[PDB]
């Protein structure tokens, strides 16, 4: 992956993730918050840790991408809702959850 | 420090600089206040980076307030208020992103 390295917040993934642009329920943070362990919404969905090197494990990165494209369940699909470039960015927030 | 100390020593140079985005000036003592409120933010987002050990995010997000603190004390520096305005408001954003991210079921300021 390219990974996202600091820059304008205009052109971040966080930004993004933090929900600009979309509805409180399609945004990243509203399911994935709380530093990627999940919000009490998102556990109510089901949502995996990403600070788990054990959910880490269980995906690889083209995986990652794929599933941002494509969703899966509550986990609503984001292609054509932001570029391939920022999906791939994105790819590599979920990853830094479990890296310092 | 924890994170809610830095934030807090934060706090009043944030708001120092907002009070000053919405003017037209270039006072001289006034551009003495900016640039010391951006590197007041500047060194809080550092202190963060470098000691509140949480994850790679955690540290992109202190970068990109970083990345958009130092536009603003370029900007006052050029005299270029217009840039100090955007470049603000930006800032604002990343400061929020973390803060959505990371305490998101918290009300939190900006
Ligand atoms: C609640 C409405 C969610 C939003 C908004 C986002 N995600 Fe999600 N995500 C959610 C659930 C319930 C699950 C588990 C789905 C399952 O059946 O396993 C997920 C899962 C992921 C994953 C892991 C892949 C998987 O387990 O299927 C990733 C990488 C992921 N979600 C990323 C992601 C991104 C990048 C989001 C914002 C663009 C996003 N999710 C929003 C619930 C919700
Ligand atoms: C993550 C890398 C952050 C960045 C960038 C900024 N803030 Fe923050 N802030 C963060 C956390 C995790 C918390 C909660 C602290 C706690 O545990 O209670 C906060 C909190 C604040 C507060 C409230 C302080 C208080 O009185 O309790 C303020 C006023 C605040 N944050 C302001 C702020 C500003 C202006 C920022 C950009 C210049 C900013 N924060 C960035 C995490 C992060």
Not at chain 2, 18 to 35: I, K
Not at chain 2, 39 to 47: N, R
Not at chain 2, 84 to 106: D, G, L, P, S, W
Request: one cysteine or more; proline letters at 3%.
């Amino acid at each position: 992956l390219n990974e996202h390295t600091a820059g304008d917040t205009t052109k971040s993934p966080y930004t993004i993730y933090a929900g600009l642009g979309f509805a409180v329920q399609e945004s990243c943070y509203y399911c994935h918050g709380n530093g990627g362990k999940g919000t009490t919404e998102g556990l109510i969905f089901g949502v995996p840790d990403f600070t788990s090197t054990e959910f880490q494990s269980s995906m690889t990165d083209k995986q990652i991408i794929d599933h941002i494209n494509k969703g899966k369940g509550k986990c609503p699909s984001y292609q054509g809702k932001m570029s391939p470039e920022m999906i791939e960015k994105m790819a590599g927030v979920v990853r830094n959850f479990a890296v310092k | 420090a924890t994170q809610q100390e830095i934030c807090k020593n934060m706090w009043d140079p944030f708001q120092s600089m907002r009070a000053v985005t919405g003017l037209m000036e270039l006072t001289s003592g006034q551009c003495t206040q900016l640039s010391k409120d951006a590197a007041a933010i500047l060194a809080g987002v550092k202190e963060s980076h470098d000691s509140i050990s949480v994850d790679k995010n955690y540290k992109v997000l202190n970068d990109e307030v970083a990345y958009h603190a130092a536009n603003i004390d370029a900007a006052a520096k050029a005299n270029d208020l217009e840039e100090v305005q955007v470049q603000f408001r930006r800032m604002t954003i990343a400061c929020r992103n973390c803060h959505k991210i990371y305490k998101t079921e918290q009300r939190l300021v900006p």
